Design a binder for this molecule. Structure first.
Ligand code: ADP
Ligand code: ADP
Ligand code: ZN
Ligand code: ZN
Ligand code: ZN
Lengths: 410, 379, 179, 188
């Protein structure tokens, strides 16, 4: 993904918004015939979990607990998951040696149950204001409803019947003179250790304190398990109910697991001329493909193009064997030996075929970029078939063109 | 119905959380770390192409709705707090991102000043908003914002950060750790905005009116021989590990004065209240004066509220404002949440009102049909 | 380089046995307790100490040069002892990297010159970036990237790690041959 | 006030003119590019060209919809929130306040003066806005001179030249003897 530079050769997406992304990041949509990007697809929320103590919490409990773990804590000074140490328990960090004793929080007899965050200072005033505005909003709703049904009736405010407990909040008292800056600030050395930085100030927003002794450790933030759903298609992919300590997908779907992935095996000279060898591995068990197209003339956004890649080669039938094969186990005649193609095809191993592209570098100053279209026989299986019961000839016949953009090192 | 989310996109920091809460859940720098870019690009930028702005806001809102808040965007409503006279194309884009990409049920474009008034409970009050870009004031009288008597000056965070950078480069004394124990000037051509902001918050403070008025005349040096008050002690600040910048005591209490300096025009952060209040209707004068509100993170700076209220009462006695605003009692309101998170708290208090929210707010079905967001400009 | 893995020619001196290749330059003081079941690679000047260990490594494990894998000591009131670490399947430890980690999960790409702290657990399908410090007793979830001197959540990985990482470690092993 | 309200709309387009010097170039922007639409609602729905204006420094600014919806506040000052009649209203009200016999002749003789009538399509809008308020089938002639800005002075220049002016003005010795009223009583 990162070790090999997947962020070089990119695949194009069809729709409203055109995007150039690596095949590793993209997803293939099986309901229809069009691969779509992580940007294009809509995101959902499945499950919440703590990154320290991996515990799958339900959606209801998260809303009550404000998307936080009760047991785990993150240090305020540096941003790292704290650890309980005994002597009878105090909270301490590994990276920085900030303790819970420093700020002056008393040690608890019970390990987890004892620790808590103080109640918000303006929580009582809050509820009183909500209830005042709630009652006041309810009056406007009744007024707006009464006005709307009178318009809908269209009786011109005809008086058939006779027309027409209060909550009163006291408004906050305005101070005559606000407290001045203490005379300590004048003629006193300022230790930058004692006062807190903006980053660690703002992590505790309810009462962001200037001094470090006031700054208490906040609960550790819960992380999210994303599930993707498309515009045209319904489902796409999702994750299990035990995503904590699991790398399994409930429905595995990705562009590399359907569309044939292209990789630049060899990179030649960048001095005005060369011959680059690229591989075209298949992922499907049995299929056919072809890199025939030259991306037309000024069509399909070929603005990035800074070279003329010929790739004048007819289709080559490659197949993947999901099994541990030996070094040159058997030599097939019709697949390998019959299309010898010594100039075009470099090598043909198991689920692998090297192809020579004749690029024209140094058309611009530098940063050589090549546009070429790749075709493949997509066994869609859109119609109802149990273990390939249906023939799926019309599906296999369908030729899907992916506009690839390979970027040479330069 | 579900508890509607509140977002407040600012140049420096964005406030995020859920309605009917004591304060915002997440507050973070309004930036995004794009691959290739060493410094992260700012998400809100006025006067750029729509497509480039659309991509930045799409990237940012995604981070807010998944990494910071954990909730589906399509399920529950939005309460977008944005200041009055926010650029047209920016607000149009922000809504278009929420309605098209995320497919939110309904957005409510509340003005920050009217939201700040709800938190106190008082129906009428003057509201000063000392933000990053511009320090804006807007009188709110019994629910109606008075756009006629608006006021704004560029004396916020950005103007203060720039002033600090200028002063530090003049009196530049850093200990690199390479025979740089001796005072070394301007080793680095520019100082990054992240450092300048941290220096401002920790080192620099707002002086008293009496001491400040002397500092103004001192640096001017208006036919006087060393008429400055005794500064605080010099604070040593680390830059990128090894390099230790010695911050001069004069810089700490002089950097702030650019806000409260008259500069001939008679245009300070203090004057902007009195300039607006004098332009207000004659009946509204005494009610607005008595109910002052000071929101924005720039006013959090230690001893700002005392200097402002003092500087007001001094500028009152000045002959221009002496006639109209002579015998007026200026009293400041202390909001429940902190000065930074007053704007957000209003939107949450408003978001808790499910019945009024749905009616006032613009539904997606209306936007998809029309493609016209309602504004204070003509329809 | 552009998806394709590049050639690396090894010298004559290297201990090739049952698929497992271990550079003779690289000392592994404590050969008894350390175990390499699969076709593992250990590059030159690397350390795998047997300080009361049980260092089990993967099928296609890779450890680049100047890199150390030492077990951590558990500060227990009952008895202070070195906790035996278990490197997962298809694990890629990058060059000049320090590892004091207990239980490193399968299909992981540990970055270059990155110090992992004492008693540090890593779950499967994660990636630590280069010049990063994971503090003692930290956990990293699957499909995650931890970075910075603090060592905290930077973002998420590509969905296809389980399938992709197999190609990387196996290709490197296959491409890494004698001169 | 139109210059002040244009500055507000220019900040709503995203261009600040905070300084007192920068207020002068807002007055220049107004004087250069600001056209009064006959129907304001139709021009708002229509997508603007966004005509570029060049500043003294050299920088370009796209004004867009602020161009036409700024001077509209003359004809409809309730939009911003200023309690006034309006330029179309004050003209009609002034005629309607006068005696019934003169109304027809006063509608038949209207003269535009000053600089805040030179707005492009001012006469076109005013004629339309006056007609609907004024009585039906009444002849409304809004006779603008070519020198509207300098009309007030030219009048004084003609008045001053006449021998009657010699009687009208107040002498320095008259002001010393008569008192303060001298200037007020001789005014008319
Ligand atoms: N707690 C604080 N203490 C001191 N200064 C602060 C604090 N929070 C923010 N600031 C400063 O004041 C500014 C407040 O800007 P803010 O109101 O968050 O942005 P915006 O005006 O774009 O909504 C910040 O840029 C920062 O420089
Ligand atoms: N060509 C013009 N187009 C639009 N507005 C103009 C034009 N010329 C002047 N103005 C406006 O009219 C003002 C001039 O008013 P003026 O006629 O001098 O008033 P007075 O009659 O009191 O002397 C300018 O400040 C400007 O706002
Ligand atoms: Zn689809
Ligand atoms: Zn936890
Ligand atoms: Zn810490």
């Amino acid at each position: 993904a990162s070790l090999l530079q997947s962020e070089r050769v990119l695949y194009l997406v069809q729709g409203e918004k055109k995007v150039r992304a690596p095949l590793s990041q993209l997803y293939f949509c099986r309901y229809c015939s069009e691969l779509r990007s992580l940007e294009c697809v809509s995101h959902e929320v499945d499950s919440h979990y703590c990154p320290s103590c991996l515990e799958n919490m339900p959606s209801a409990e998260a809303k009550l607990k404000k998307n936080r773990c009760a047991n785990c804590f993150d240090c305020p000074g540096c941003m790292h998951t704290l650890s309980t140490r005994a002597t009878a328990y105090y909270l301490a960090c590994g990276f920085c040696r900030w303790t819970s004793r420093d700020v002056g929080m008393a040690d608890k007899s019970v390990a987890s149950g004892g620790w808590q965050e103080p109640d918000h200072p303006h929580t009582q005033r809050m509820n009183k204001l909500i209830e005042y505005y709630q009652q006041l909003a309810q009056k406007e709703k009744v007024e707006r409803d009464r006005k709307k049904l009178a318009r809908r009736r269209n009786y011109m405010p005809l008086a058939f019947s006779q027309h027409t407990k209060e909550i009163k909040i006291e408004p906050a008292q305005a101070v005559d003179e606000v407290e001045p800056l203490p005379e300590d600030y004048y003629t006193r050395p300022v230790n930058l250790t004692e006062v807190t930085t903006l980053q660690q100030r703002l992590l505790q927003p309810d009462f962001q304190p200037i001094c470090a002794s006031q700054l208490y450790p906040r609960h550790k933030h819960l992380l999210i398990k994303r599930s993707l759903r498309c515009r045209q298609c319904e489902h796409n992919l999702s994750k299990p109910e035990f995503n904590p300590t699991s790398i399994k997908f409930k429905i595995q779907l990705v562009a590399v697991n359907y569309i044939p992935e292209v990789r630049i095996m060899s990179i030649p000279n960048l001095r005005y001329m060369k011959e680059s060898q690229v591989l075209l591995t298949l992922t499907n068990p049995v299929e056919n493909l072809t890199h025939v197209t030259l991306l037309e003339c000024e069509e399909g956004d070929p603005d990035d193009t800074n070279s003329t890649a010929k790739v004048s080669v007819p289709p080559t039938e490659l197949v993947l064997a999901g099994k541990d094969a030996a070094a040159e186990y058997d030599e097939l005649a019709e697949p390998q030996d019959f299309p010898d193609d010594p100039d075009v095809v470099a090598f043909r191993k198991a689920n692998k075929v090297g192809v020579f592209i004749k690029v024209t570098p140094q058309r611009e100053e530098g940063d050589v970029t090549v546009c070429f279209k790749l075709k493949h026989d997509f066994k869609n299986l859109a119609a109802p078939i149990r273990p390939v019961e249906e023939a799926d000839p019309g599906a296999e016949v369908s030729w899907l063109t992916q506009h690839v953009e390979l970027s040479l090192g330069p | 119905e579900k508890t509607a989310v509140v977002i407040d996109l600012g140049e420096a920091f964005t406030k995020c959380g859920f309605a009917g809460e004591t304060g915002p859940r997440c507050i973070i720098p309004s930036v995004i770390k794009k691959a290739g870019m060493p410094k992260p690009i700012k998400v809100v930028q006025y006067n750029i192409n729509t497509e480039e702005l659309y991509s930045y806001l799409k990237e940012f809102i995604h981070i807010l709705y998944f990494r910071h808040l954990l909730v589906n965007p399509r399920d529950r409503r939005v309460v977008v707090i944005e200041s009055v006279l926010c650029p047209s194309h920016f607000r149009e884009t922000l809504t278009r991102v929420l309605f098209k990409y995320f497919e939110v049920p309904s957005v409510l474009l509340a003005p920050s000043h009217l939201m700040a008034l709800l938190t106190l409970g008082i129906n009428s009050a003057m509201v000063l908003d000392c933000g990053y870009r511009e320090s804006l004031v807007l009188p709110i009288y019994e629910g109606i914002p008075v756009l006629n008597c608006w006021g704004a000056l560029p004396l916020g965070g950005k103007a203060l950060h720039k002033e600090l950078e200028t002063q530090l480069l003049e009196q530049c004394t850093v200990d690199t750790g390479a025979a740089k124990e001796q005072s070394l000037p301007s080793v680095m051509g520019s100082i990054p905005e992240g450092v300048l902001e941290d220096i401002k918050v920790r080192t620099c403070f707002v002086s008293d009116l009496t001491r400040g008025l002397k500092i103004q005349a001192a640096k001017f040096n208006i036919d006087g021989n060393t008429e400055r008050p005794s500064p605080p002690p010099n604070v040593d600040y680390p830059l990128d590990g090894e390099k230790i910048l010695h911050v001069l005591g004069s810089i700490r209490d002089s950097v702030v004065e650019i806000l409260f300096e008259q500069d001939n025009e008679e245009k300070s952060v203090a004057t902007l209240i009195l300039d607006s209040l004098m332009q207000c209707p004659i009946d509204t004068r005494k009610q607005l004066a008595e109910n002052l509100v000071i929101i924005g993170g720039t006013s959090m700076l230690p001893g700002f509220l005392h200097r402002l209220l003092a500087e007001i009462r001094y500028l009152v006695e000045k002959p221009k404002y002496k006639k109209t605003l002579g015998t007026k009692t200026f009293r400041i309101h202390t909001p429940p949440a902190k000065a930074n998170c007053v704007a957000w708290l209003g939107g949450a208090i408003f978001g808790a009102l499910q019945d009024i929210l749905g009616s006032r707010s613009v539904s997606k079905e209306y936007y998809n049909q029309t493609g016209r967001i309602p504004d204070w400009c003509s329809l | 380089m552009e998806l394709g893995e590049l050639l690396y020619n090894k010298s004559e001196y290297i201990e090739t046995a049952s698929g497992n290749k271990v550079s003779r330059q690289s000392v592994l003081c404590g050969s008894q307790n350390i175990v390499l079941n699969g076709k593992t690679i250990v590059m030159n000047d690397c350390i795998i100490r047997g300080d009361l260990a049980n260092v089990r490594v993967g099928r296609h494990c890779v450890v680049k040069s100047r890199s150390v894998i030492r077990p951590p000591f558990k500060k227990f009131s009952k008895g202070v002892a070195f906790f035996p670490l278990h490197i997962g399947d298809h694990v890629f430890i990058e060059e000049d990297c320090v590892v004091n980690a207990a239980q490193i999960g399968s299909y992981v790409h540990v970055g270059k010159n990155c110090v992992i702290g004492r008693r540090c657990v890593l779950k499967d399908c994660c990636k630590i970036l280069d010049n990063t410090v994971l503090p003692p007793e930290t956990v990293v979830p699957p499909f995650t990237v931890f970075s910075g001197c603090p060592g905290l959540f930077s973002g998420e990985l590509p969905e296809c790690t389980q399938e992709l990482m197999i190609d990387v470690t196996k290709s490197y092993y296959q491409k890494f041959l004698p001169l | 006030d139109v210059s002040r309200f244009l500055r507000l709309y220019l900040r709503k387009e995203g261009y600040d003119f905070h300084s007192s010097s920068e207020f002068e170039i807002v007055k220049a922007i107004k004087e250069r590019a600001c056209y009064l639409s006959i129907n304001p609602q139709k021009d708002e729905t229509l997508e603007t060209e966004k005509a570029q204006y060049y500043l003294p420094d050299g920088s370009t600014i796209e004004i867009g919809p602020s161009r036409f919806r700024a001077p509209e506040l003359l004809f409809r000052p309730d939009l911003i929130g200023e309690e006034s009649e309006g330029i179309h209203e004050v003209l009609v009200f002034a005629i309607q306040k006068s005696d019934m016999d003169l109304r027809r002749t006063l509608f038949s003789n209207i003269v535009l003066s000053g600089g805040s009538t030179l707005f492009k399509g001012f006469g076109d809008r005013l004629l339309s806005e006056v007609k609907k308020l004024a009585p039906k089938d009444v002849k409304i002639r809004i006779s603008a001179p070519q020198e509207r800005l300098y009309s007030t002075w030219i009048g004084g220049s003609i008045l001053a030249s006449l021998d009657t002016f010699k009687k009208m003005w107040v002498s320095k010795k008259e002001y010393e003897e008569d008192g303060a009223r001298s200037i007020h009583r001789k005014t008319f």
